Amino acid sequence: PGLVLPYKYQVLAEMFRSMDTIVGMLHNRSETPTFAKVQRGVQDMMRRRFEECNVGQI
Amino acid sequence: IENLEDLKGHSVREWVSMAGPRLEIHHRFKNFLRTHVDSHGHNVFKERISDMCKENRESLVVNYEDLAAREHVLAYFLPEAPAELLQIFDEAALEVVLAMYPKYDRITNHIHVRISHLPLVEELRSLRQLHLNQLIRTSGVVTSCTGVLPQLSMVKYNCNKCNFVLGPFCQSQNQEVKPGSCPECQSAGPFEVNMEETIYQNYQRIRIQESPGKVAAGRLPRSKDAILLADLVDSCKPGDEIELTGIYHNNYDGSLNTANGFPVFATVILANHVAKKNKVAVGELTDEDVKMITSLSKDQQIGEKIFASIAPSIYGHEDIKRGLALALFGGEPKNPGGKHKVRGDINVLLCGDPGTAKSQFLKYIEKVSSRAIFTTGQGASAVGLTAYQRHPVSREWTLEAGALVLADRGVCLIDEFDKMNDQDRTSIHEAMEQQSISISKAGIVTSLQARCTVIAAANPIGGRYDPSLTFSENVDLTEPIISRFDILCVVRDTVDPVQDEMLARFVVGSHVRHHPSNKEEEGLANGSAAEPAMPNTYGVEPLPQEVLKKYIIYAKERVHPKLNQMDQDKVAKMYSDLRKESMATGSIPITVRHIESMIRMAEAHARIHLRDYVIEDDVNMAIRVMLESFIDTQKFSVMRSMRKTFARYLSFR
Amino acid sequence: DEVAEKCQKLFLDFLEEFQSSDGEIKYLQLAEELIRPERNTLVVSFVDLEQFNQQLSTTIQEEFYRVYPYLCRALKTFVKDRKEIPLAKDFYVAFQDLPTRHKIRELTSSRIGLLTRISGQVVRTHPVHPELVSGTFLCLDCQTVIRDVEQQFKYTQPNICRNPVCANRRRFLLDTNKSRFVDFQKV
């Protein structure tokens, strides 16, 4: 069989790669990443707003 | 040498200390500089070598997304402790520029590489001792800068004992050599003062301040010392929101270690890379907001969409709210002349009868914008304005700044302007004529840029305002400052039984909506509201809060309206109709200020509807605004000769 | 001294014997937050310590400057039994909740070492400034690195180096990535 690709599930697949970069170099010796100040770091090359509904599907 | 995740009991500043794993890391970054593989496959890093040697710009930049995508196992080992990884990498760049360009060795070496676009940005308040010696990207507005300073870095001393002159020495603020362990195998002899054997090194210090956009009422600002070494010199200007990356390193003094017991304990930031931002903020916005603003702009009622949202606390005075929205854009300061730089800012001067709450209309525009300040009259003077002496601690000279320089490309709010001193009103004309100040102190001149829109609130002389007198004489202000604004729309409150039923009805409706107990079921509880929207005077729904935030950071930095040549000659002969009619009853004629200002409001309304060029529908609604403000500066008796005659011009759309 | 060591062994058992509301200790929920290296909360209630011991808490407030290094090593050992912690970050005792308040005009000459509370209000505000606590120097005579350098209230310099031949009787060199600082405010 072949393979398909939508548009709503491929965003969260590549977002996990750009998400571990703001949690590894900060939680080891500085503050702990939360769910408030991290909205700026995840709003760069994505140009899409991230809230709480996207967390329930992950 | 291959695997780097197995430190074997070592720390971060120990595994990359020897030359073991360095063999593979150095050979990987060296071959990648000449072999650049981007999207389509264009080697652009090879051409950048020949571009940095033309103007002797030793600042090789590189994108962080390129090094993080090719090596997924190296995107974390770099932001660890890059204090020693970038210093050793500078020697690798010298082996590349000299291998292909042998003529570059004639100039000085030690090329400091750069790095831009960092995935992390920290504010200037959350940094303490946990971020010590960490390359963190921190932005902020520049308060002041320093020019050339002859830093004592190497002083020659003539000695005679073994035919060896003493030197070079170390006396800079970075590191020094304390007496007791001389680098020349611990030797010392006679000294002799010279006069031409002293080679100084460039050294400048920059003041960093917080951005006024996140400053609330009831907070104290903080300062930050920024130390910049060589290479990156004169790269920033005072009063400009830029971006400078550096290492949060402590301060190592050398002047108080001979008398005091504790040295200067301070945390500064060194220089590594600069980035002058304005134009890059609109390119990094979201995508879902661009689609929703185009669906609402298709209607022909978007003009009154923002006029009904200005100050939703006091009802009435519709003509006042129209001038506040147009002054938020500030126009587009261009160069219409051929050698003279004509300013292009919309300056509005408000002055009403004390009793109608004139200062509450200004407290709303400062919260819906991105940069706005607020000052009084007796709280500042000629000193705390734009620039004013030295640093009397160890013989130093450092100029400072005021409040108009840091408020670049923003909206300034000045309260209590009529009670200002006479020596202060005659010194503010320099800042509101060229948007720049030439500080000529200590023989060092430096020009900057300060885009501001003066918004003041004056009061009549003594008691209340009297409409029987002219506006130029009713307020205790000079005459050269009046001919520098544009919108002079003033109002006079009086007892009117035909309209007093909406004032008492709107203040009691907003008293419950703006109550902290009512916000528990509205702001706290999502999906519920006690009172809906207030009945406006146009039947258009107002705007909440998030609409005005993403409105000025998009339309102002996207479409640039040009200057066409439509029926502009019709205004030429129309101006002559009022020029030879004003003195026929008793009024001053219209000067050339109302002619060159028509382009300001023409491009302001075209930016709302997103027009690439000016249209005739924008120049018509701009004449009714400049005429309604000029008639309020004369006598009420001559209003029947100007309004009835020019009734065809005050009725458009 | 053996007097300061006795006030630390009995204080370690206070965090497990004296309960709070139910059958849980208020310090149990605080231990889960100390694992994250950005928050160091060590609130100790004085009105609850007197319920378990009174003569033991007398020497704590009477002589507090001497038992200062003993409180840092006792709380670090107790939290070690809860969960293993790294050996690269210290703590600080946050003793609060004092029912006794002293007046600014009520002071003599032996007020040092007394853990009290002062009232009043602050007007002037100064920015933060670091402080050399745990540093590392380097002898410029024999080229030897000396670790574990604690700075009290003066310029504590190693008078005797590692080599028992000569020493550096002048100045040293401040380390870079091997020096922990603690910022403070001089309000």
Curated annotation (Swiss-Prot), chain A:
Induction per the UniProt record: Induced by E2F transcription factors.
Top-level taxonomic group: Eukaryota
Membrane spanning stretches: none
PTM note: Two independent E3 ubiquitin ligase complexes, SCF(SKP2) and the DCX(DTL) complex, mediated CDT1 degradation in S phase. Ubiquitinated by the DCX(DTL) complex, in response to DNA damage, leading to its degradation. Ubiquitination by the DCX(DTL) complex is necessary to ensure proper cell cycle regulation and is PCNA-dependent: interacts with PCNA via its PIP-box, while the presence of the containing the 'K+4' motif in the PIP box, recruit the DCX(DTL) complex, leading to its degradation.
Subcellular location: Nucleus; Chromosome, Centromere, Kinetochore
Clinical condition linked: Meier-Gorlin syndrome 4: A syndrome characterized by bilateral microtia, aplasia/hypoplasia of the patellae, and severe intrauterine and postnatal growth retardation with short stature and poor weight gain. Additional clinical findings include anomalies of cranial sutures, microcephaly, apparently low-set and simple ears, microstomia, full lips, highly arched or cleft palate, micrognathia, genitourinary tract anomalies, and various skeletal anomalies.
Assembly behavior: Interacts with GMNN; the interaction inhibits binding of the MCM complex to origins of replication. Interacts with MCM6. Interacts with CDC6; are mutually dependent on one another for loading MCM complexes onto chromatin. Interacts with PCNA. Interacts with LRWD1 during G1 phase and during mitosis. Interacts with NDC80 subunit of the NDC80 complex; leading to kinetochore localization. Interacts with GRWD1; origin binding of GRWD1 is dependent on CDT1. Interacts with KAT7. Interacts with ubiquitin-binding protein FAF1; the interaction is likely to promote CDT1 degradation.
Family label: Belongs to the Cdt1 family.
Organism: Homo sapiens
UniProtKB/Swiss-Prot annotation, chain B:
Keywords: Acetylation, ATP-binding, Cell cycle, Chromosome, Deafness, Disease variant, DNA replication, DNA-binding, Helicase, Hydrolase, Isopeptide bond, Metal-binding, Non-syndromic deafness, Nucleotide-binding, Nucleus, Phosphoprotein, Ubl conjugation, Zinc, Zinc-finger
GO terms under biological process: apoptotic process; cellular response to interleukin-4; cochlea development; DNA replication; DNA replication initiation; double-strand break repair via break-induced replication; mitotic DNA replication initiation; nucleosome assembly
GO molecular function, one term: DNA binding
Nucleotide-binding among keywords: yes
Lineage top rank: taxon: Eukaryota
Catalytic activity from the UniProt record: ATP + H2O = ADP + phosphate + H(+)
Localization per Swiss-Prot or TrEMBL: Nucleus; Chromosome
Domain named MCM: residues: 302-507
Region span, Disordered: 514-533
One annotated Gene Ontology cellular component of this protein: nuclear origin of replication recognition complex
Residue(s) carrying Phosphoserine: 211, 313
Binding site for ADP: 359-360
Zinc finger map (C4-type): 159-185
Modified positions (N6-acetyllysine) in chain numbering: 46
Keyword Transmembrane helix belongs to the record: no
Major localization class: nucleus
Cross-linked residues, Glycyl lysine isopeptide (Lys-Gly) (interchain with G-Cter in SUMO2): 8
Cysteines engaged in disulfide bonds, as pairs: none
Additional notes on this entry: Early fractionation of eukaryotic MCM proteins yielded a variety of dimeric, trimeric and tetrameric complexes with unclear biological significance. Specifically a MCM467 subcomplex is shown to have in vitro helicase activity which is inhibited by the MCM2 subunit. The MCM2-7 hexamer is the proposed physiological active complex.
Disorder: Deafness, autosomal dominant, 70: A form of non-syndromic sensorineural hearing loss. Sensorineural deafness results from damage to the neural receptors of the inner ear, the nerve pathways to the brain, or the area of the brain that receives sound information. DFNA70 is characterized by slowly progressive, postlingual hearing impairment.
Family: Belongs to the MCM family.
Protein name: DNA replication licensing factor MCM2
Organism: Homo sapiens (Human)
Higher taxonomy: Eukaryota, Metazoa, Chordata, Craniata, Vertebrata
Section covered of the full-length record: 171 to 825 of 904
From Swiss-Prot, chain C:
Keyword Cell cycle: yes
Protein's name in the database: DNA replication licensing factor MCM6
Quaternary structure annotation from Swiss-Prot or TrEMBL: Component of the MCM2-7 complex. The complex forms a toroidal hexameric ring with the proposed subunit order MCM2-MCM6-MCM4-MCM7-MCM3-MCM5. Component of the CMG helicase complex, a hexameric ring of related MCM2-7 subunits stabilized by CDC45 and the tetrameric GINS complex. May interact with MCM10. Interacts with TIPIN. Interacts with CDT1. Interacts with MCMBP. Interacts with DDI2.
GO cellular component, one term: MCM complex
Extra facts: Early fractionation of eukaryotic MCM proteins yielded a variety of dimeric, trimeric and tetrameric complexes with unclear biological significance. Specifically a MCM467 subcomplex is shown to have in vitro helicase activity which is inhibited by the MCM2 subunit. The MCM2-7 hexamer is the proposed physiological active complex.
Function field: Acts as a component of the MCM2-7 complex (MCM complex) which is the replicative helicase essential for 'once per cell cycle' DNA replication initiation and elongation in eukaryotic cells. Core component of CDC45-MCM-GINS (CMG) helicase, the molecular machine that unwinds template DNA during replication, and around which the replisome is built.
Outcome reported for the amino acid change (mutating residue 130 to S): Found in a patient with mild developmental delay and autism spectrum disorder; uncertain significance
PTM text: O-glycosylated (O-GlcNAcylated), in a cell cycle-dependent manner.
Residues represented out of the complete protein: 20 to 206 of 821
Any single GO BP term: double-strand break repair via break-induced replication
Family as reported in the entry's similarity comment: Belongs to the MCM family.
Compartments reported by the entry: Nucleus; Chromosome
GO MF annotation, one: ATP binding
The UniProt record lists the keyword Secreted: no
Major subcellular location class: nucleus
Keywords in alphabetical order: Acetylation, ATP-binding, Cell cycle, Chromosome, DNA replication, DNA-binding, Glycoprotein, Helicase, Hydrolase, Nucleotide-binding, Nucleus, Phosphoprotein
